[PDB]
Amino acid sequence: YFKIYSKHTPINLVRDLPQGFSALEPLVDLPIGINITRFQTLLALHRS
Amino acid sequence: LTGTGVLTESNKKFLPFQQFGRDIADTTDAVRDPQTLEILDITPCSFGGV
Ligand SMILES: *[C@@H]1O[C@H](CO)[C@@H](O)[C@H](O)[C@H]1NC(C)=O
Ligand SMILES: *[C@@H]1O[C@H](CO)[C@@H](O)[C@H](O)[C@H]1NC(C)=O
């Protein structure tokens, strides 16, 4: 099971992670049962 | 979740994922019911020595 936990906290600190506490509630559990050893982030492009 | 006890209304702020919150002795203390998604207390039926 691939579980996802999440939290969205309003911050304004410029660069690093904030100094404080914030708990991440579970969001959805995925009954997938696959072999995972790698992951990759997805981004977007900008053409003007 | 078989068990015997008196059900009441609960003010325990069960977050959406939380359903069947326990106590120290790992026995259920407050359960969120099926078919209604409403939160109830479980305090045991009154007992004591004689
Ligand atoms: C997942 O793949 C790796 C090879 O990259 C292998 O060594 C491992 O046994 C696999 N695990 C499962 C659960 O299939
Ligand atoms: C049936 O159960 C669902 C929760 O799975 C609930 O949202 C719904 O209100 C229930 N309907 C009736 C008629 O009890």
UniProtKB/Swiss-Prot annotation, chain A:
**Reported impact of D16G:** In strain: Beta/B.1.351
User: Which sites carry carbohydrate?
Assistant: N35
The job of this chain, per UniProt, is described as: Attaches the virion to the cell membrane by interacting with host receptor, initiating the infection. The major receptor is host ACE2. When S2/S2' has been cleaved, binding to the receptor triggers direct fusion at the cell membrane. When S2/S2' has not been cleaved, binding to the receptor results in internalization of the virus by endocytosis using host TFRC and GRM2 and leading to fusion of the virion membrane with the host endosomal membrane. Alternatively, may use NRP1/NRP2 and integrin as entry receptors.
Oligomeric state and interaction partners are given as:
Binds to host ACE2. RBD also interacts with the N-linked glycan on 'Asn-90' of ACE2. Cleavage of S generates a polybasic C-terminal sequence on S1 that binds to host Neuropilin-1 (NRP1) and Neuropilin-2 (NRP2) receptors. Interacts with host integrin alpha-5/beta-1 (ITGA5:ITGB1) and with ACE2 in complex with integrin alpha-5/beta-1 (ITGA5:ITGB1). May interact via cytoplasmic c-terminus with M protein. May interact (via N-terminus) with host bilirubin and biliverdin, thereby preventing antibody binding to the SARS-CoV-2 spike NTD via an allosteric mechanism.
User: What name goes with this protein?
Assistant: Spike protein S1
Q: Which organism is it from?
A: Severe acute respiratory syndrome coronavirus 2 (2019-nCoV)
According to the entry, what is the taxonomic lineage of the organism? Viruses, Riboviria, Orthornavirae, Pisuviricota, Pisoniviricetes
From Swiss-Prot, chain B:
Q: Which domain of life is it from?
A: Viruses
What, per the annotation, is the impact of changing T2K? In strain: Omicron/BA.1
Q: Could you give the subunit structure recorded for this chain?
A: Binds to host ACE2. RBD also interacts with the N-linked glycan on 'Asn-90' of ACE2. Cleavage of S generates a polybasic C-terminal sequence on S1 that binds to host Neuropilin-1 (NRP1) and Neuropilin-2 (NRP2) receptors. Interacts with host integrin alpha-5/beta-1 (ITGA5:ITGB1) and with ACE2 in complex with integrin alpha-5/beta-1 (ITGA5:ITGB1). May interact via cytoplasmic c-terminus with M protein. May interact (via N-terminus) with host bilirubin and biliverdin, thereby preventing antibody binding to the SARS-CoV-2 spike NTD via an allosteric mechanism.
Instruction: Describe the task this protein carries out.
Output: Attaches the virion to the cell membrane by interacting with host receptor, initiating the infection. The major receptor is host ACE2. When S2/S2' has been cleaved, binding to the receptor triggers direct fusion at the cell membrane. When S2/S2' has not been cleaved, binding to the receptor results in internalization of the virus by endocytosis using host TFRC and GRM2 and leading to fusion of the virion membrane with the host endosomal membrane. Alternatively, may use NRP1/NRP2 and integrin as entry receptors.
* Name of the featured protein: Spike protein S1
Please tell me the species this chain comes from.
Severe acute respiratory syndrome coronavirus 2
